[PDB]
Amino acid sequence: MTSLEKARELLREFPVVDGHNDLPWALREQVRYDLDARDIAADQSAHLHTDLARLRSGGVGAQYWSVYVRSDLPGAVTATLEQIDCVRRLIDRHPGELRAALTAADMEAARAEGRIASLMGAEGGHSIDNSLATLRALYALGVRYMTLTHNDNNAWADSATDEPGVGGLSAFGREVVREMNREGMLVDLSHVAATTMRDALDTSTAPVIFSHSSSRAVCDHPRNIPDDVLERLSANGGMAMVTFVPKFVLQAAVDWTAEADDNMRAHGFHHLDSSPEAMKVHAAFEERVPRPVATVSTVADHLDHMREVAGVDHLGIGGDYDGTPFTPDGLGDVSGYPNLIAELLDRGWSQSDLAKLTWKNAVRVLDAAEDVSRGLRAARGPSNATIEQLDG
């Protein structure tokens, strides 16, 4: 049998727990949650990275559905609740394929049934509107991780893609990490600045995750993780879940995006400007300078290195499917994972390495959060501290 045939057999036993998929956001944006217009029980390949048949072909057995919302629009709490409701509806619509998962035991029960465990992760600390009770409410509704920032600073944590602000976490950001630990909610350090990564590692008495971050040593971009941070993962007990975003994982794509943004600025536009005029300048650039293409090999290079630095017990996969418009060759949509495992097989990764990578690490990590939480819930009550009290 080929390495791809081997990869599929491996995935049948220990399937992918994917750390981050933005299908609910794509459904919000494409069809305002008209679930029938994007039915995942049918082929959605013209519109979406994700449907159920492709998840099957990809060997996915658990998914952290992102409940991402925009930090630059008001009503983030309300939008979050709508994102969470989008997830609940998908689960309710597809009970043969999907099973709601709140615990590492739910993940395993799902695997033994052959259903995809469906968990949730909030994407950015703005979803709590500086309110500890709101954090506790997201937990009560099934949220099992929170990325401390999205693309911009919040009042209490700094983003990797914004200028320095509080300098990592503030006193209230530490308090947030504390309540996350006591609740049992995974601290997600994707998107945050390296200063924040280090403060959260200092504060957290539970394993933390990176739900969709690759390697900064392999490809220098601040969305990636520095080696000094990966080096602390073993003691912390968490895991880094490699992402596929070409403009994070391929040096040529990083350089290209930077040159493209510089060209946008040369024409007097903000790089994120999406006007028709902004779009004309961009197409003219891409006409001159074709976009580089990342491959399965590009992603495997991050994994090789993270494995060397962090260790095989501290890795996972977070594809950012439906969260990003571009993908690596061979990692086109959520059916792609077997191509990555086949590559890793060709590079001498053992079958147990690979089962840790796909399944066992993520289960271990969520279990550990639950454990830490039990201790902290018996030790003290929930915090009633305010951002005003702690941060002034």
Ligand SMILES: C[C@H](N)P(=O)(O)C[C@@H](CC(=O)O)C(=O)O
């Ligand atoms: C819209 C998604 N929720 P995102 O902005 O997090 C997308 C990617 C990056 C990108 O595709 O622009 C990221 O994870 O940093």
Ligand SMILES: [Zn+2]
């Ligand atoms: Zn993201």
Ligand SMILES: [Zn+2]
């Ligand atoms: Zn996302």
